[PDB]
Amino acid sequence: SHHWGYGKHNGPEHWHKDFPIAKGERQSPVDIDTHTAKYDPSLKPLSVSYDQATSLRILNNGHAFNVEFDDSQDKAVLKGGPLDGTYRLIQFHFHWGSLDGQGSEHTVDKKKYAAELHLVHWNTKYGDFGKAVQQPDGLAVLGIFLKVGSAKPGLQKVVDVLDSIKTKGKSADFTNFDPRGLLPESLDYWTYPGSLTTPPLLECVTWIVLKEPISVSSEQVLKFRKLNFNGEGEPEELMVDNWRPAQPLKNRQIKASFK
Ligand SMILES: CCOC(=O)CCc1ccc(S(N)(=O)=O)cc1
Ligand SMILES: CCOC(=O)CCc1ccc(S(N)(=O)=O)cc1
Ligand SMILES: [Zn+2]
- Please state, in angstroms and as integers, the Cα–Cα distance from residue 8 to each residue in 145, 148, 185, following that order: 25, 27, 38
Is residue 41 reached through a cis peptide bond, with omega within 30 degrees of 0 on the bond before it?
no
- Please state, in angstroms and as integers, the Cα–Cα distance from residue 239 to each residue in 70, 185, 196, 229, following that order: 26, 29, 19, 5
Going by alpha carbons, the residue nearest to atom 17 of ligand 1 is: 3
For strand 44-49 and strand 139-148, is the pairing parallel, antiparallel, or unpaired? unpaired
Q: Is 254 exposed, middle or buried (0-12, 13-18, 19+ CB in 10 A)?
A: buried
For strand 65-69 and strand 171-173, is the pairing parallel, antiparallel, or unpaired? unpaired
- Please state, in angstroms and as integers, the Cα–Cα distance from residue 184 to each residue in 84, 146, 193, 212, 244, following that order: 24, 10, 23, 6, 23
Of the candidates 252, 218, 223, the one whose C-alpha atom is nearest the C-alpha of residue 238 is 223
Is 63 catalytic? The answer is: yes
CA 176 to chain CA centroid, Å, is 21
Q: What span, in angstroms and rounded, lies between the C-alpha atoms of 141 and 38?
A: 20
Cα angle: 126, vertex 129, 131; to 5 degrees: 50
Ion ligand 3, residues whose Cβ is below 5 A away: 118
CB 70 within 8 A of CB 56: yes
Q: Is 104 exposed, middle or buried (0-12, 13-18, 19+ CB in 10 A)?
A: buried
Q: Which ligand 2 atom is at minimum distance from the Cα of 196?
A: 14
Tabulate helix, strand, coil % of the chain (nearest 5). Answer: 15, 30, 55
- Ligand 2 pocket test, candidate residues 6, 92, 120, 142, most atoms within 8 A of CB: 120
Half-sphere exposure of 66 (CA within 13 A, CB side): 15
Going by alpha carbons, the residue nearest to atom 14 of ligand 2 is: 196
Report CA dihedral (21, 24, 30, 31) to the nearest 10 degrees: 140
Return the sign of the alpha-carbon dihedral for residues 11, 244, 207, 158: positive
**Total residue length of the chain:** 259
Residues pairing with 190 in the sheet? 209, 256
Greatest C-alpha distance within the chain: 54
Of the candidates 86, 64, 91, 84, the one whose C-alpha atom is nearest the C-alpha of residue 182 is 91
Q: What span, in angstroms and rounded, lies between the C-alpha atoms of 114 and 96?
A: 6
**What CATH number does the domain located at 1-259 have?**
3.10.200.10
CB 196 less than 6 A from any atom of ligand 2: yes
Residues pairing with 89 in the sheet? 121
CB 22 within 8 A of CB 195: no
Of the candidates 181, 185, 171, 180, the one whose C-alpha atom is nearest the C-alpha of residue 77 is 180
Which parts of the chain fold into alpha helices (H)?
Answer: 129-132, 156-161, 218-224
CB 132 less than 6 A from any atom of ligand 2: no
Q: What span, in angstroms and rounded, lies between the C-alpha atoms of 159 and 225?
A: 11
CB 37 within 8 A of CB 153: no
SS3 for 131?
helix
CA of 14 to the centre of ligand 1 (A): 7
DSSP labels, 193-243: EE--SSTT--S-EEEEEESSPEEE-HHHHHHHTT-BSSPTTSPP-B-----
CB 205 within 8 A of CB 140: yes
For strand 44-49 and strand 77-81, is the pairing parallel, antiparallel, or unpaired? antiparallel
Q: How many helices (H) and strands (E) does the chain have?
A: 3, 15
